[PDB]
């Protein structure tokens, strides 16, 4: 009720042993009343690491997207050693959204590592049951086995009607996903853990389809980008193996579904100025016949007997021997180019004179023609170059023209394909212009480059006039905080870009930009500026392969950065970057990598690896950081995964107030925006959620002063949220959330929620279950409020009540007594947290009334087992409002799975194999349904204290020869766990 505090564990320990005498009654009662629940004491079980590898085949659906709406691939297993380390070998094959699938090694939700199928963005198949949202859905297949060696799993995805179907050895898998959101590009993905060798049959060159694809399903090898060569890589990696060592890698940029939609700049909407004819004729005359200039007597000599139809591709007629209605299309063509120039804001220059004054009619002696004599019809107009502004300008001309053509082709029904199939309306060139290969780009734009340099020769030289996941901060553990001496640590810039590097205090904020506040002293080498509570130019921009020295000396209270063994002087010329630096808590190596950035954080584990150290740092008196440190230095990376954390009392903008004991008003937690209508007002979408869940029953059975018998027979619970006066109901969203809700959307609405309907299959094809899973079961307050209500000055103070019922798993929402049509029916053993996602529009925003209704027990009786039959509303200190914080720290694992990926053969296809088993001990928080690393407690000292006192309670309750209690404790703490904790050095 009050919460996790170690003093109650101290009391429980004092209950057991008294002056060296064991009280058997207390030792048995504490065990029986605490251990079996497994909901209050942190649990530790050893699990396996899970690593996912994708073929980077990103396909999707959008309004006008060039991508095809059906795809199919295969994965077949070569070897599986099941149960290699006394745990299920995590093997899963399926699709996954490119925006939302973040299978970071270690940690994760549930009781284990996450693969494809442990999140509502990825949908996998274990061979026996489907996986989505971290739950197993048993399906009917002829094999009824987990995918074993010499077994092929076919997987197809249809976007037009969203459906992912699986097939085991040519036998259809009954039960498919449906109605999943298409926001983002799906890609094939397998999670293999350890002791698994699989291979991707993508069809065509990349493997062979052992089973024929279903009709209408294109092979996945026909979706590789033209500019990109097919490969296999992890979904997202914060560390990549390299020659010098572990290369820390920042967040990567993935293509969005909006990129594949070719919306061009409209050119026919604008009218032409009265100068239309003048530029049009001069531009048209040459462009009529440049191709003739390039093809007469070099291609196929034209004959007047025919018309460019029997090996006569060029033609030289300035009189336009082809029909004039056909020919004046070229005049209207140059007019259209003028319209496009107007759309891009290009005017009529006349900077130079007429180019015909310096016209050099270039008719080579080799080039000649019978008809119309031999004359150079194209206007060479001597020579003229292209200004770089005009090269980028003609680049966007070609971009706009190709986007117009691509949009028109999409309207016709064309789609992108690696291998061109004209009858199937498939070709490799309708991908958007930035997605076009460079050869296609230049082949598009060469003619317009000639035309635009002709325009410049005429004289028309007219110019055309946070997500918290674009920086990744890697810092040392707070355990290695140095407070004295001189330390040196190198940082190599493998990829040039925004890669801040320096020394940070241990209280470094996760989402705050590195060096923006006073908690860091960093150097931005991309543009050359030192950052600490601001920015100032310093040093010089670096290049690829450059190493920064990053020395601190706290004897002199200064920080020095050196580039390639040369001290970076400041703008004033002083050698030291920062001066007069208090020691404070301490300093830690730190580096924030930007998007698509690679940096080698070379701490001084060995001076042999430390290059340029003797050049700068061995002489000056700087000890290398971690010189004698036997084990590798442990790092912490900004996880960039939204996590629900308690609202800080000292939050500059948000306040939570507890009011209780009122005769009419029940206990309640209200939210107040402290500084509203001020210079610093945050209208960001605040995601608030109560700390404790209301778990649903294991089996969903059919089951004025209030009636006591009904009160004891009640399985429904009431909970209201009152929206304060002046707060818009159009900005509130009242309901429930699952413990795996990770969505910090700044413009969140009801259509952004994760929702996948697993429709079970029967042999005849008719549906069996059709069970829906959703991430948050919420209802918009704008739906309750009547349209047309404006200002909110009526002070309605609408309350939204959530009548949940655990015996049937059914929740229904009400507003001011008016029943709402929004009803939800969920699975058994589901944990729902009360939650409101509100955009603040008033000084007082919302308030959680934890009250009750007629013949309905309050939510305290739902969360708290000790108050199971208590109908009086109450709120102990554990029940607190928590905000969705965007970024939190995460320990980098000491070792990662070594996965060998390579193309086995031209017909075998790409293959992925892992043979090294890695195990970690997981600290599972029961009520939140998330497991951290047991080593991650080295910096979270409150959980460390609680777990240490929990272990001490275990020892006290099994002490003095309690063999029965020791046997009871062996279930919670296994022999493998004990041996792994003994051997673990971190």
């Amino acid at each position, epitope marked *: 009720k009050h919460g996790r505090n170690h003093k109650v564990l101290d009391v429980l320990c004092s209950l057991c042993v008294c002056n060296g005498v064991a009280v058997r009654s207390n030792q048995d009662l504490i065990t029986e009343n605490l251990l079996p629940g497994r909901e209050l004491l942190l649990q530790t079980n050893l699990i396996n690491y899970v690593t996912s590898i994708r073929p980077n085949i990103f396909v999707g659906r959008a309004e006008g997207s060039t991508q095809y709406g059906k795809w199919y691939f295969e994965v077949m297993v070569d070897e599986v050693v099941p149960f290699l380390t006394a745990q299920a070998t995590h093997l899963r094959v399926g699709w996954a959204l490119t925006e939302g699938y973040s299978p970071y090694p270690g940690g994760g939700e549930g009781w284990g590592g996450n693969g494809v199928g442990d999140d509502l963005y990825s949908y996998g198949f274990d061979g026996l049951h489907l996986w989505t949202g971290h739950v197993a859905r048993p399906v009917t297949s002829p094999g009824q086995h987990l995918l074993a060696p010499e077994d092929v799993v076919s997987c197809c995805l249809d976007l037009s009607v969203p459906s992912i179907s699986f097939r085991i050895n040519g036998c259809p898998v009954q039960g498919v996903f449906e109605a999943f959101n298409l926001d983002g590009l799906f890609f094939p993905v397998v999670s293999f853990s350890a002791g698994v060798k699989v291979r991707f049959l993508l069809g065509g060159r990349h493997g062979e389809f052992k089973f024929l694809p279903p009709p209408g399903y294109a092979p996945c090898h026909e979706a590789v980008l033209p500019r990109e060569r097919l490969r296999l890589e992890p979904i997202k990696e914060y560390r990549r193996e390299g020659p010098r060592g572990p290369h820390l890698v920042g967040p990567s940029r993935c293509l969005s579904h909006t990129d594949f939609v070719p919306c061009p700049v409209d050119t026919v909407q604008i009218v032409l100025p009265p100068h239309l004819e003048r530029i049009r004729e001069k531009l048209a005359e040459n*462009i*009529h016949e*440049l*191709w003739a200039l390039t093809r007469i007597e070099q291609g196929w000599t034209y004959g007047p007997v*025919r*018309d*460019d*139809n*029997k090996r*006569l*591709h060029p*033609c030289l007629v300035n009189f336009h021997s*082809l*029909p004039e*209605p*056909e*020919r004046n*299309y*070229n005049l209207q*063509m140059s007019g259209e180019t003028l319209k496009t120039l107007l759309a891009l804001g290009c005017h009529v220059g006349m900077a130079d004179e007429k180019a015909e004054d310096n016209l050099k009619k270039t008719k080579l002696p080799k080039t000649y023609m019978m008809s119309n004599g031999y004359k150079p019809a194209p206007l060479d107009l001597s020579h003229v170059r292209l200004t770089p502004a005009q090269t980028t300008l003609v680049d966007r001309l*070609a971009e706009n*023209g*190709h986007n117009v*053509w691509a949009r*028109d*082709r999409v*309207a*016709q029904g064309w789609s992108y394909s690696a291998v061109q199939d*004209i*009858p199937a309306r498939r*070709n490799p*060139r309708l991908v958007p212009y930035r997605l076009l290969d460079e050869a*296609t780009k230049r*082949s*598009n734009r*060469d*003619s317009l480059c000639q035309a635009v340099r002709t325009l410049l020769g005429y004289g028309y030289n007219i110019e055309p006039p946070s997500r918290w996941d674009r920086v990744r901060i890697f810092r040392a553990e707070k355990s290695y905080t140095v407070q004295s001496g001189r330390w040196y640590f190198e940082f190599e810039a493998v990829t040039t870009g925004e890669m801040r590097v320096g020394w940070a205090r241990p209280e470094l904020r996760p989402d705050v930009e590195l060096g923006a506040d006073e908690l860091a002293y960093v150097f931005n080498g991309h543009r050359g500026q030192r950052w600490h509570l601001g920015s100032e130019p310093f040093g010089r921009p670096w290049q690829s392969g450059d190493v920064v020295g990053c020395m601190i000396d706290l004897t002199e209270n200064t920080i020095i950065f050196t580039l390639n063994g040369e001290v970076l002087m400041s703008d004033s010329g002083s050698e030291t970057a920062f001066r007069e630096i208090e020691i404070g808590d301490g300093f830690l190596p730190v580096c924030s990598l930007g998007p698509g950035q690679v940096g080698h954080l070379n701490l001084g584990q060995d001076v042999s690896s430390l290059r340029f150290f003797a050049i700068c740092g061995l002489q000056e008196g700087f000890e290398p950081f971690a010189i004698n440190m036997q084990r590798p230095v442990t790092t912490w990376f900004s996880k960039s995964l939204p996590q629900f954390e308690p609202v800080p009392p000292e939050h500059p903008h948000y306040e939570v107030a507890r009011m209780d004991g009122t005769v009419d008003t029940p206990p309640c937690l209200r939210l107040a925006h402290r500084t509203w209508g001020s210079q610093n007002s945050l209208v960001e979408m605040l995601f608030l959620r109560l700390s404790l869940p209301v778990q649903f029953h294991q089996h969903f059975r059919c089951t004025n002063r209030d009636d006591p018998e009904i009160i004891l027979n009640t399985t429904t619970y009431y909970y209201s949220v009152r929206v304060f006066a002046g707060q818009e109901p159009s900005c509130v969203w009242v309901g429930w959330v699952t413990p795996d809700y990770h969505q910090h959307d700044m413009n969140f609405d009801l259509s952004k929620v994760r929702a996948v309907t697993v429709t079970m299959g029967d042999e005849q094809g008719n549906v069996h279950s059709s069970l829906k899973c959703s991430n948050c079961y919420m209802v918009w307050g704008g739906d309750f409020v009547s349209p047309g209500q404006q200002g909110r000055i009526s002070h309605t103070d609408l309350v939204i009540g959530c009548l949940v019922d655990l015996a049937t798993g059914l929740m229904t929402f009400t507003a001011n007594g008016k029943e709402s049509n929004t009803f939800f029916q969920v699975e058994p053993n589901t944990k729902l947290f009360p939650a409101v996602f509100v955009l603040p529009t008033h000084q007082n925003v919302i308030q959680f009334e934890l009250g009750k209704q007629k013949n309905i027990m309050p939510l305290s009786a739902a969360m708290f087992l000790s108050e199971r039959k208590n109908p009086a509303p109450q709120c102990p200190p554990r029940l607190e409002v928590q905000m969705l914080m965007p970024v939190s720290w995460s320990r980098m694992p000491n070792h990662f799975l070594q996965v060998e990926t390579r193309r086995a053969g031209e017909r075998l296809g790409w293959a992925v194999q892992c043979q090294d088993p890695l195990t970690m001990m997981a600290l599972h928080i029961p009520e939140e349904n998330r497991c951290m690393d047991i080593l991650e407690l080295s910096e979270r000292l409150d959980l460390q204290r609680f777990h240490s006192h929990t272990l001490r309670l275990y020892r006290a309750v099994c002490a003095l020869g309690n063999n029965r209690v020791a046997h009871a404790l062996c279930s919670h703490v296994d022999q493998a766990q004990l041996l792994h904790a003994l051997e673990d050095a971190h």
Partner: nanobody, 126 residues
Framework: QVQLQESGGGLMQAGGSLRLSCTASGSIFSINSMGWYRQAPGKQRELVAT???????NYADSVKGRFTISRDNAKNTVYLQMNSLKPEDTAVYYC?????????????????????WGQGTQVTVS
């Protein structure tokens, strides 16, 4: 938007009259130098002569037999007479309308491929 409704396709023996009609329904843009890419079954689309706006007959690879091709200016329907049917003439005739003039292209690949290619009909011919 410019969809070409090619109609006909009745099975006639060699030497039977087959006047077929491709109704080029759509915008006036991308309508000239339009040709019947008759895709032979399993064997690719040979181009029938290419007539531009104004009936400019330009002989192409498949001009084997009779091939009287004439586009109505107002009705915007190409009438292609196939009296001299041949075993080589059996194909799904697929008329495509483009804006590039025949053998006369100041653009490059974007407009070279900028053709409203509509669905034809299977002219099965003995």
């Amino acid at each position: 938007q410019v969809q070409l409704q090619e109609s006909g396709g009745g099975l006639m023996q060699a030497g039977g009259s087959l006047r077929l009609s491709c109704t080029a329904s759509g915008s006036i843009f991308s309508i000239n130098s339009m040709g019947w890419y008759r895709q032979a079954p399993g064997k690719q689309r040979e181009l029938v002569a290419t007539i531009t706006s104004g009936n400019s007959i330009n002989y192409a690879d498949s001009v084997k037999g009779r091939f009287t091709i004439s586009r109505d200016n107002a009705k915007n329907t190409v009438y292609l007479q196939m009296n001299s049917l041949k075993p080589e003439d059996t194909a799904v005739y697929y008329c495509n309308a483009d804006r590039v003039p025949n053998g006369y292209n100041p653009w490059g690949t974007p407009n070279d491929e900028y053709d409203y290619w509509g669905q034809g009909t299977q002219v099965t011919v003995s």
